[PDB]
């Protein structure tokens, strides 16, 4: 490939930078300290663990390249203390520091693609055994979960054990916490689950053993709220609300956290909704004048969730396994289920592995 | 008590506020919407679950008090739709919206007191069985963990099972994740544990079965860094670093996250350090010019950790159970241990419960 072959490589700027001219005619710049830190030799790097052995205390932050050789596919660098490093062209190209290359790689790692929905949702559906058996189907399943926030699996048995069977096949680890002490447990006001936790459970897997649920796309609701009621959006995305879960589950517990109901990342993108009205504390840590406008904003948020254009209604049949993003969807309803929760890290892990397996 | 008895109560500002004059001569202001939202009657509130039954859609955000009666200890309110609410004086007083009362209550819920340390640390120590048996001792144990970041328990057996025994007695739930699939598992470069997780494990419990560890107070290090090297502190508290844990543990896994090495809350206070050099990815999602100054800053951070004034050294003896804050401490060392991790929510829960039991 023209994009991935080296036409020229040289040290620049007191040898503190390496510039690559690709046959593509594209150009890339690599800091010497980063190349040294990421030497793939066996003194510096453990292949089997994919881990860096090099210590920060061994790294000269003012290092420059002493000598550089290249061909079409490799760069060969000598350091001032005679350490020697070889870098592959493809490895360098992927890790290029341009905004375009970095953003491309981030998309590949974190799967940010998102499809918003409302009442017009076609509930994504795949066969249970297909997902159990074949990488392509398991991959479709998880990528749809991440993109859409919900996927249905049909054709599981109507017997207990299917959630555990699915977990084992996927290599999932399931969460336990107060109110959900076992990995798999038997199960109108829209809510997310367990906002009293500092890190609410990411993904829920529900299996219908014996048999309406309503759901909204929280990210879609937030986007409409920001447009129609910007001040409401500002209040809900900036006000820390106390959530409190007090009870007994083999022991007495008092689980408490503060969350913004609309949780944004550094770029102002919604990453989680934290909302259960039952669990919202009587304790409200805001100046008195902030209180009534907070409730006005909450009312607008909840009005939007209850609007006909937002809500999707569905019925769970025996053998259905529904999986959903508890950070994104809110649910409610106006029954023998088995359910488990997983951390998003476990699900994203599987998504990454499966994508690699499908691509090969 | 003079502070907690009502000299006068009245509706103000179109009945949208309730003002309380305490016999103390202090004054408090309560929004009508918040009083309505927090009606303790059995239509609105579930005592046993300590949960609100009232729906957001049933709450008039523009509500005002229709009628108000009071005595020394209670307020009796009638709403415009004839709903009726009684509030206790002590309950109101505690939930007062003044900055002083709110901050007091937050301290009581979240235990923010923090004692920084270095090489001069006297390792807090309590007896294992004492902690197992008596609330006062268990309370001292957990409050010291939260304040100091580390506590040693002495006088456990030198046999396996003590971590599990301690967990059961405390009603703890233990975490599992890739690299630590069992609740209790057998176990120089300063690091925190498992930063590749979006929510790294909060608390570690280590029990020495058969027998130097070094530790630093990460919060103390950050405070010194901010003072001596403010630009380094700024870089480390604002730059998202990729952490990556790839391997096999019953299944193939690829766990990945981005963290600021120095993680601040909204008020600029350090809440977590996320740092393991082995796990820090080769992938670095920053503009090229940001790279070398990041490494310079990291080097200053690590230099500070390795300085003689920062490091505390100790040896684990058989029967020792060491507990520490994995969000705060970094550790390393230049051996038969059993270990478990817990979420801070589980530990804070126990701390709250124990404080109430000790106070009674
Ligand atoms: Zn090397
Ligand atoms: Zn009521």
This entry's atomic model was obtained through X-ray
The structure tokens 């080296």 sit at A6
The answer to whether A96 is annotated as binding is no
CB A93 within 8 A of CB A75: no
d(CA B144, CA B203): 13
d(CA B110, CA B352): 9
What is the H or E stretch that residue B34 is in?
A: helix B32-37
Cβ-based neighbours of B339, under 8 Å, separated by 6 or more: B163, B184, B185, B186, B187, B204, B205, B206, B207
Three-state secondary structure call for residue B222: helix
Q: Do A173 and B177 touch (CB under 8 A)?
A: yes
d(CA A98, CA A206): 43
User: What are the C-alpha distances in Å from B322 to residues A54, A316, B203, B316, B337?
Assistant: 29, 48, 10, 8, 11
Asked if B139 has any chain A CB less than 8 Å from its own CB, the reply is no
Tokens representing A15 are 């040898």
Q: CA torsion sign, A265 to A267 to A270 to A275?
A: positive
Between A and B, how many residue pairs show a Cβ–Cβ distance under 8 A?
Answer: 209
Beta bridge partners of B74: B88
Q: Which domains are present in chain A? A: 1-98 (3.30.2020.30), 99-360 (3.60.130.10)
A172 — phi, psi (to 5°)?
A: -65, 150
DSSP letters of B255-300?
A: EEEEEESEEE-TTS-EEEE---TTTB-S---S-GGGHHHHHHHHHH
Q: What does the CA dihedral A204, A209, A212, A217 come to, rounded to 10 degrees?
A: 20
Asked if B315 has any chain A CB less than 8 Å from its own CB, the reply is no
DSSP state of B212: -
What is the H or E stretch that residue A3 is in?
A: none
CA diameter of chain B: 72
Q: How far is CA A66 from the centre of its chain?
A: 41
CB A327 within 8 A of CB A265: no
What is the H or E stretch that residue B58 is in?
A: none
d(CA B263, CA B243): 14
d(CA A301, CA A236): 9
For residue A31, list chain B residues with Cβ-Cβ distance below 8 A.
288, 291-292
d(CA A253, CA A245): 8
Asked if B248 has any chain A CB less than 8 Å from its own CB, the reply is no
CB B109 within 8 A of CB B101: no
Cβ-based neighbours of B63, under 8 Å, separated by 6 or more: B16, B32, B33, B36, B79, B80
Query: Which ligand is the nearest neighbour of the Cα of A52?
Result: 1
Q: Considering only CA atoms, which of B181, B160, B201 is closest in space to residue B347?
A: B201
Helices (H) and strands (E) in chain A — how many of each?
A: 10, 21
The answer to whether B83 is annotated as binding is yes
d(CA B217, CA B129): 27
Q: Do A291 and B33 touch (CB under 8 A)?
A: yes
Is residue B310 classed exposed, middle or buried when 0-12, 13-18 and 19+ CB atoms within 10 A define those classes? buried
Q: Please, what is the Cα angle at B250 between B249 and B255, to 5 degrees? A: 45
Beta bridge partners of A141: none
Query: Scanning every residue of chain B, which has its alpha carbon at the shortest distance from the alpha carbon of A238?
Result: B266
CB A324 within 8 A of CB A344: no
Cβ-based neighbours of B197, under 8 Å, separated by 6 or more: A343, A345, B177, B245, B255, B257
Q: Do B283 and A95 touch (CB under 8 A)?
A: yes
A132 — phi, psi (to 5°)?
A: -60, -35
Nearest by CB to residue A299, choosing from B54, B61, B282, is B61
Distance from CA of B303 to the nearest CA of A (A): 8
The structure tokens 């990460």 sit at B218
Is residue B302 classed exposed, middle or buried when 0-12, 13-18 and 19+ CB atoms within 10 A define those classes? buried
Query: Which ligand is the nearest neighbour of the Cα of A54?
Result: 1
Q: Considering only CA atoms, which of A3, A47, A37 is closest in space to residue A23?
A: A3
Q: Considering only CA atoms, which of B59, B60, B65 is closest in space to residue B13?
A: B65
DSSP state of B56: G
Three-state secondary structure call for residue B133: helix
DSSP state of A290: G
For residue B56, list chain A residues with Cβ-Cβ distance below 8 A.
189, 277, 298-299, 302
DSSP letters of A322-338?
A: EEEETTTEEEE---EEE
Beta bridge partners of A257: A243
Q: Please, what is the Cα angle at A17 between A14 and A19, to 5 degrees? A: 120
DSSP letters of A6-17?
A: EEEEEEETTTTE
User: What are the C-alpha distances in Å from B187 to residues B158, B225, B244, B337, B340?
Assistant: 15, 32, 20, 5, 9
Three-state secondary structure call for residue A185: strand
d(CA B14, CA A306): 30
CB A29 within 8 A of CB B288: yes
Query: Scanning every residue of chain A, which has its alpha carbon at the shortest distance from the alpha carbon of B94?
Result: A283
Beta bridge partners of A210: A336
CA diameter of chain A: 72
Distance from CA of B69 to the nearest CA of A (A): 22
What ranges make up the beta strands (E) of A56-169? 67-70, 74-78, 84-88, 125-127, 150-154
d(CA B248, CA B264): 33
Cβ-based neighbours of B230, under 8 Å, separated by 6 or more: none
Cβ-based neighbours of A310, under 8 Å, separated by 6 or more: A118, A119, A216, A217, A220, A221, A224, A304
Q: Do B284 and A34 touch (CB under 8 A)?
A: yes
What is the H or E stretch that residue A18 is in?
A: strand A17-22
């Amino acid at each position: 490939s023209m994009a991935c072959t080296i036409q020229k490589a040289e040290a620049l700027d007191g040898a503190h930078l390496m510039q690559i001219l690709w046959y593509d005619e594209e150009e890339s710049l690599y800091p010497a300290v980063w190349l040294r830190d990421n030497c793939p030799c066996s003194d510096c790097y453990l292949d089997s663990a994919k881990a860096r052995k090099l210590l920060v205390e061994a790294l000269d932050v003012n290092i420059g390249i002493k000598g550089l050789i290249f061909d079409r596919k490799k760069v060969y660098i000598t350091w001032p203390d005679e350490h020697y490093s070889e870098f592959q062209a493809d490895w360098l190209k992927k890790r290029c520091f341009s905004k375009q290359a970095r953003a491309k790689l981030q998309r590949e790692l974190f799967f940010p693609e998102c499809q918003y929905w409302g009442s017009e949702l076609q509930l994504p559906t795949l066969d249970f055994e297909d997902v159990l058996r074949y990488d392509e189907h398991a991959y479709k399943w998880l990528s749809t979960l991440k993109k859409v926030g919900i996927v249905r699996l049909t054709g599981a048995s109507d017997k207990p054990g299917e959630v555990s069977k699915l977990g084992k096949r996927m290599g999932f680890l399931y969460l336990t916490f107060y109110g959900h002490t076992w990995q798999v447990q038997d199960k109108l006001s829209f809510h997310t689950d367990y906002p009293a936790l500092h890190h609410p459970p990411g993904v829920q897997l529900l299996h219908c053993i014996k048999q309406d649920s309503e759901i909204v796309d929280g990210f879609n609701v937030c986007q409409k709220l920001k447009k129609n009621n910007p001040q409401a959006f500002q209040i809900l995305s900036s006000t820390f609300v106390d959530f409190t879960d007090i009870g007994v589950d083999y022991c007495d517990f008092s689980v408490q956290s503060k969350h913004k109901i609309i949780e944004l990342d550094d770029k102002g993108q919604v990453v989680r909704i934290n909302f259960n009205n039952a669990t919202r504390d009587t304790i409200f840590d805001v100046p008195v004048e902030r209180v009534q406008p907070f409730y006005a904003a909450l009312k607008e948020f909840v009005d939007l969730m209850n609007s006909k254009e937002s809500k999707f209604t569905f019925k769970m049949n025996p053998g259905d396994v529904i999986t959903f993003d508890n950070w994104r969807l809110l649910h409610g309803r106006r029954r023998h289920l088995e359910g488990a929760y997983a951390d998003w890290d476990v699900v994203m892990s599987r998504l990454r592995i499966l994508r690699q397996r499908v691509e090969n």
